[PDB]
Amino acid sequence: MDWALFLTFLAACGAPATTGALLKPDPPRWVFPLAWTSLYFLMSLAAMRVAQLEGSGQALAFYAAQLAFNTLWTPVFFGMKRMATALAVVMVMWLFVAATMWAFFQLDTWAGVLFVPYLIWATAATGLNFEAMRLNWNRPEAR
């Protein structure tokens, strides 16, 4: 554990948490932020553990990547409602979430375990968006 690292990783999660606060997507109303606080805590904890180990550069490169495409996804799907663009982003995102998880696993089992529920959300995100997709596949404004 290191407080600088952890606080740094959680602070970074404020970027996608903001997206969600602003473009509230779309069940009692505490479930969504409670689900997200847990996810942000779990992944900041995992990155913090991994950030201290030798050989972690690649996993941390993956972590930056999933984090940025996470932040991108919400405003492209729910903001611009550009469903095709948003499909590519979410699959690229899903790929880095999985990549992070697996690279975490190969350095630290706990770090990988702590990312499983986040891969589950990313799988939800992809599913939702695959549909929105080819309901709107023929409207090039949605694309």
Ligand X SMILES: CCCCCCCC/C=C\CCCCCCCC(=O)OC[C@H](CO)OC(=O)CCCCCCCCCCCCCCC
Residues forming contacts to ligand OLC in the complex (CB under 6 A) are 7, 10-11, 13-14, 16-17, 19-21, 25, 33, 36-37, 40, 70, 74, 91, 94-95, 123-124, 126-128
Does residue 106 belong to the site contacting a second copy (CB under 8 A)? Answer: no
List C-alpha distances in Å: 103 to 31, 66, 113: 30, 13, 11
**Helix (H/G/I), strand (E/B), else coil: 26:** coil
Report the candidate in 20, 135, 33, 117 with the shortest Cα–Cα distance to residue 73: 20
Q: What is the token pair recorded at 52?
A: 């201290």
CB of 139 to ligand X, least distance (A): 22
Does residue 67 belong to the site contacting a second copy (CB under 8 A)? Answer: yes
Piece of 33-41, 49-57, 118-126, 129-137 that binds a second copy (CB under 8 A): 49-57
Piece of 29-37, 68-76, 116-124, 126-134 that binds a second copy (CB under 8 A): 68-76
Helices 31-50 and 57-74, interaxial angle, to 10°? 160
Q: Which residue is nearest to ligand OLC (CB)?
A: 20
Where does residue 2 fall: left (phi above 0), alpha (psi -120 to 50 degrees), or beta otherwise? beta
Query: Site residues (CB under 6 A) for ligand X?
Result: 25, 32, 35-36, 38-39, 42, 117, 120-121, 124-125
